[PDB]
Design an enzyme around this catalytic site. Structure first.
Site, PDB file in Angstrom:
ATOM      1  N   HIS A  14       0.901  -0.868   0.011  1.00 49.72           N
ATOM      2  CA  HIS A  14      -0.222   0.121  -0.150  1.00 49.72           C
ATOM      3  C   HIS A  14       0.561   1.014  -0.022  1.00 49.72           C
ATOM      4  CE1 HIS A  14      -3.937  -1.364  -0.339  1.00 49.72           C
ATOM      5  NE2 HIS A  14      -3.146  -2.760   1.132  1.00 49.72           N
ATOM      6  N   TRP A  84      -6.632   2.147   4.942  1.00 48.71           N
ATOM      7  CA  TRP A  84      -6.843   1.022   4.662  1.00 48.71           C
ATOM      8  C   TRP A  84      -7.445  -0.099   5.632  1.00 48.71           C
ATOM      9  CZ3 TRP A  84      -6.925  -1.927   0.450  1.00 48.71           C
ATOM     10  CH2 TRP A  84      -7.185  -1.024  -0.735  1.00 48.71           C
ATOM     11  N   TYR A 130      -5.652  -1.674 -20.237  1.00 54.14           N
ATOM     12  CA  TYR A 130      -6.442  -0.722 -18.411  1.00 54.14           C
ATOM     13  C   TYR A 130      -4.756  -0.838 -18.021  1.00 54.14           C
ATOM     14  CZ  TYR A 130      -7.524   0.315 -14.741  1.00 54.14           C
ATOM     15  OH  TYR A 130      -7.427   0.964 -13.385  1.00 54.14           O
ATOM     16  N   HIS A 167      -7.765 -10.434  -6.185  1.00 53.93           N
ATOM     17  CA  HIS A 167      -7.669  -9.048  -5.436  1.00 53.93           C
ATOM     18  C   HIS A 167      -8.187  -8.616  -3.344  1.00 53.93           C
ATOM     19  CE1 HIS A 167      -8.178  -6.295  -8.807  1.00 53.93           C
ATOM     20  NE2 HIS A 167      -6.856  -6.319  -8.651  1.00 53.93           N
ATOM     21  N   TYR A 182       0.055  -8.617 -10.491  1.00 56.85           N
ATOM     22  CA  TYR A 182       0.477  -7.382 -11.322  1.00 56.85           C
ATOM     23  C   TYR A 182       2.360  -7.584 -11.734  1.00 56.85           C
ATOM     24  CZ  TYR A 182      -3.680  -5.158  -9.932  1.00 56.85           C
ATOM     25  OH  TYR A 182      -4.880  -4.679  -9.826  1.00 56.85           O
TER      26      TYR A 182
HETATM   27  O1  LIG Z   1      -7.309  -3.174  -8.336  1.00 52.09           O
HETATM   28  C1  LIG Z   1      -7.454  -2.040  -8.829  1.00 52.09           C
HETATM   29  N1  LIG Z   1      -6.997  -1.341  -8.689  1.00 52.09           N
HETATM   30  C2  LIG Z   1      -6.608  -1.144  -6.979  1.00 52.09           C
HETATM   31  C3  LIG Z   1      -5.680   0.574  -7.247  1.00 52.09           C
HETATM   32  C4  LIG Z   1      -5.058   0.173  -5.909  1.00 52.09           C
HETATM   33  C5  LIG Z   1      -4.291   1.758  -5.257  1.00 52.09           C
HETATM   34  C6  LIG Z   1      -4.540   1.609  -4.042  1.00 52.09           C
HETATM   35  C7  LIG Z   1      -4.178   1.133  -3.378  1.00 52.09           C
HETATM   36  O2  LIG Z   1      -3.631   1.565  -2.062  1.00 52.09           O
HETATM   37  C8  LIG Z   1      -4.684  -0.266  -3.436  1.00 52.09           C
HETATM   38  C9  LIG Z   1      -4.932  -0.682  -4.442  1.00 52.09           C
HETATM   39  N2  LIG Z   1      -5.759   0.992  -8.192  1.00 52.09           N
HETATM   40  C10 LIG Z   1      -6.002   0.970  -9.550  1.00 52.09           C
HETATM   41  C11 LIG Z   1      -6.102   1.788 -10.261  1.00 52.09           C
HETATM   42  C12 LIG Z   1      -6.042   3.390 -10.100  1.00 52.09           C
HETATM   43  C13 LIG Z   1      -6.595   3.964  -8.873  1.00 52.09           C
HETATM   44  C14 LIG Z   1      -6.695   4.944  -8.944  1.00 52.09           C
HETATM   45  C15 LIG Z   1      -8.110   5.493 -10.502  1.00 52.09           C
HETATM   46  C16 LIG Z   1      -7.361   4.879 -10.740  1.00 52.09           C
HETATM   47  C17 LIG Z   1      -7.049   3.578 -10.991  1.00 52.09           C
HETATM   48  C18 LIG Z   1      -6.007  -0.113  -9.560  1.00 52.09           C
HETATM   49  N3  LIG Z   1      -6.714  -0.745 -10.740  1.00 52.09           N
HETATM   50  C19 LIG Z   1      -7.538  -1.407 -10.630  1.00 52.09           C
HETATM   51  C20 LIG Z   1      -9.222  -2.648 -11.230  1.00 52.09           C
HETATM   52  C21 LIG Z   1      -9.883  -3.366 -10.688  1.00 52.09           C
HETATM   53  C22 LIG Z   1     -10.594  -2.981  -9.854  1.00 52.09           C
HETATM   54  C23 LIG Z   1     -11.035  -3.406  -9.456  1.00 52.09           C
HETATM   55  C24 LIG Z   1     -11.690  -5.395  -9.986  1.00 52.09           C
HETATM   56 BR1  LIG Z   1     -12.390  -6.513  -9.270  1.00 52.09          BR
HETATM   57  C25 LIG Z   1     -10.450  -5.075 -11.729  1.00 52.09           C
HETATM   58  C26 LIG Z   1      -9.908  -4.227 -11.424  1.00 52.09           C
HETATM   59  O3  LIG Z   1      -6.400  -2.807 -11.372  1.00 52.09           O
HETATM   60  O4  LIG Z   1      -5.427  -2.965 -11.651  1.00 52.09           O
END
Ligand SMILES: O=C1N2C=C(c3ccc(O)cc3)N[C@@H](Cc3ccccc3)C2=N[C@@]1(Cc1ccc(Br)cc1)OO
Length: 187
Positions: A14, A84, A130, A167, A182
């Protein structure tokens, strides 16, 4: 379904993301910046309709909201990680009770945009489009590691239900089975 909040690797996962979201190294981020970024990606890079974009914005707003972030407030690192802990706890409680999680709601909205067939699943090329637009993954090789970690469906696609489970393990619980989701992009 159990958290691991004292794990330095959870905290550092995080903090990696906080630093990635803090693109101008202010040491703080706002909800305003989060929903801007979200809508910028989907509208300007991924072809979202107006309705799809608003659905996506609502999901992202609710997601970071659940971590304590608010419009007009600058969230520093200590506040971000404490929020968080609340988000992950709430999300795991929902998941255990078979109630939709905020991350699933975001996923459904995002996948409606990214999946050209709108059936809840994405190809590798779509995942590449994406994550590279968002910036969360830079290289093709890391995007390809996602598809190694995830249970891929019969058509070679990544279903929103599978990505939600991965996730939970990756962002909320430090499940060893979800490591490298990732690739090398996010430790
Ligand atoms: O799971 C996903 N995350 C998780 C995070 C994240 C960030 C900080 C943190 O401390 C923990 C997690 N960030 C992003 C990218 C993003 C951030 C803000 C605005 C737009 C896009 C993200 N995109 C996703 C989009 C997503 C969401 C749900 C599912 Br099911 C699939 C994909 O996939 O990469």
């Amino acid at each position: 379904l159990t958290s691991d909040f004292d794990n330095p690797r959870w905290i550092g996962r995080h903090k990696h993301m906080f630093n990635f979201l803090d693109v101008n190294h202010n040491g703080k981020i706002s909800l305003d910046e989060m929903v801007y970024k979200a809508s910028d990606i989907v509208i300007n890079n991924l072809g979202a309709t107006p309705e799809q974009a608003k659905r996506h914005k609502d999901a992202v707003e609710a997601f970071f909201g659940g971590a304590g972030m608010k419009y007009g407030v600058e969230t520093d690192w200590p506040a971000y990680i404490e929020g968080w802990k609340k988000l992950a706890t709430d999300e795991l409680e929902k998941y255990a009770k078979n109630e939709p999680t905020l991350i699933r709601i975001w996923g459904d909205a995002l996948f409606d945009i990214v999946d050209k067939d709108q059936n809840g699943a994405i190809t590798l090329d779509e995942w590449k489009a994406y994550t590279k637009a968002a910036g969360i993954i830079q290289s093709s090789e890391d995007c390809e590691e996602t598809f190694r970690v995830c249970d891929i469906d019969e058509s070679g696609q990544l279903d929103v239900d599978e990505m939600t489970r991965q996730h939970l393990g990756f962002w909320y619980t430090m499940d060893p089975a979800c490591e490298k989701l990732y690739g090398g992009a996010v430790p």
